[PDB]
């Protein structure tokens, strides 16, 4: 259904990516480098429906809900690189923040051979549907915590690509102009 397409765990902008320009490329990828300390913030991605491209066409072709928002990450580490972050990774448009976000939906990942995580964001929103408008559905934040750990090694930098999905509901509602098309 349309849903597998939006659905089948796609990859994401998410943001514009301080690019190589690898960051189109990327998209899915925040950066993973070592770090002077580990706790410092490196990201803050904003989610809509609108914005980042795969989400965009679907969102215009509809303007209601049914769904959830699953973001599952994957890693290109090495023997030699390793890595860990934690990602929020945030419903709807709260606190913008550290602990508030940790307080959020939650996943803790090891980035070793697992090569996949499920951080799923739900739309925790007063109404079942949010319509397509400009300000924001809300933020997804990532925090890279501890880098990479290592070897000799791997050129230093490691990268992740984020994955996006919704359930439960697969099904939305109200079709509207789809981003792609003719005239």
């Amino acid at each position, epitope marked *: 259904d349309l849903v597998k397409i939006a659905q089948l765990f796609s990859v994401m902008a998410d943001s514009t990516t301080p690019s190589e320009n690898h960051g189109v490329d990327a998209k899915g990828y925040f950066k993973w480098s070592a770090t*002077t*300390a580990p*706790q*410092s913030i490196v990201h803050r991605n904003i989610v809509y429906l609108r914005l980042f491209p795969n989400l965009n066409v679907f969102v215009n072709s509809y303007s209601y809900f049914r769904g959830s928002l699953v973001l599952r990450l994957s890693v290109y580490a090495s023997t030699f690189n390793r890595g860990r972050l934690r990602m929020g990774f945030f419903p709807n448009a709260t606190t913008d*923040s*550290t602990s508030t976000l940790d307080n959020a939906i939650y996943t803790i990942c090891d980035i070793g051979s697992d090569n996949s995580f499920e951080i799923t964001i739900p739309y925790s929103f007063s109404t079942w549907m949010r319509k397509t408008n400009g300000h924001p559905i809300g933020l997804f934040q990532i925090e890279v915590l501890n880098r990479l750990t290592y070897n000799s090694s791997s050129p230093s930098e490691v990268y992740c690509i984020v994955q996006g999905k919704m359930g439960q509901d697969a099904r939305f509602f109200c079709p509207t102009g789809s981003v792609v098309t003719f005239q």
Partner: antibody
Amino acid sequence: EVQLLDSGGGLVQPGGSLRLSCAASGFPFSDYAMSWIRQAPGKGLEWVSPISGSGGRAYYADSVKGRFTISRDNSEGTVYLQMNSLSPDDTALYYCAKDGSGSHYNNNYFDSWGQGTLVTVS
Amino acid sequence: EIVMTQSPATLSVSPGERATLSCRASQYVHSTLAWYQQKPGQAPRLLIYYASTRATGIPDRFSGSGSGTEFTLTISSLQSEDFAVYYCQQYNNWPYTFGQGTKLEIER
């Protein structure tokens, strides 16, 4: 218009401890990062510590490490340095300063300095 | 361990002439470099940040360029009030650090 006003510095014995304060105005204080930088007689400027917004992450220079502690009061928009373990190398004129990251980069440029408080650890 | 270094420890320039201050770094710093001017007994003054953007209230005779590990502060026609010490500083990585300063003195 940024006004960074600094009090609290005075002559102190070695092994002593001072608490410097610097109060800010005319900018949204609680969004900006803030640093203390000092200036020794017969010396240039050394950044000492900076604190990040929420009073979250703070960093220090190796000289100052465990001796000095940086704390913000955002409810009164003030900045604090607690200088323990004072040695003569700490004699200086201390300035509070306000840094900004601009748009979405990683550099923090200072845009306003205060007037200077003198700490004579002798 | 990022260390900045200003070549002219003291620049003696005639009034009205131009002056050029250099500031290298021991590792790449991209464009997060800023320049400061300091008169005796006063707080420092921000002249340039982002390597090249002039701050508000800074005349056009002041200008900065360069990137990486090498920067320059050019002042077109040095005026009487441009008599001072100048410091560069980088913010590309912690801890943040300043140069040892360049003293621009009136040459006669």
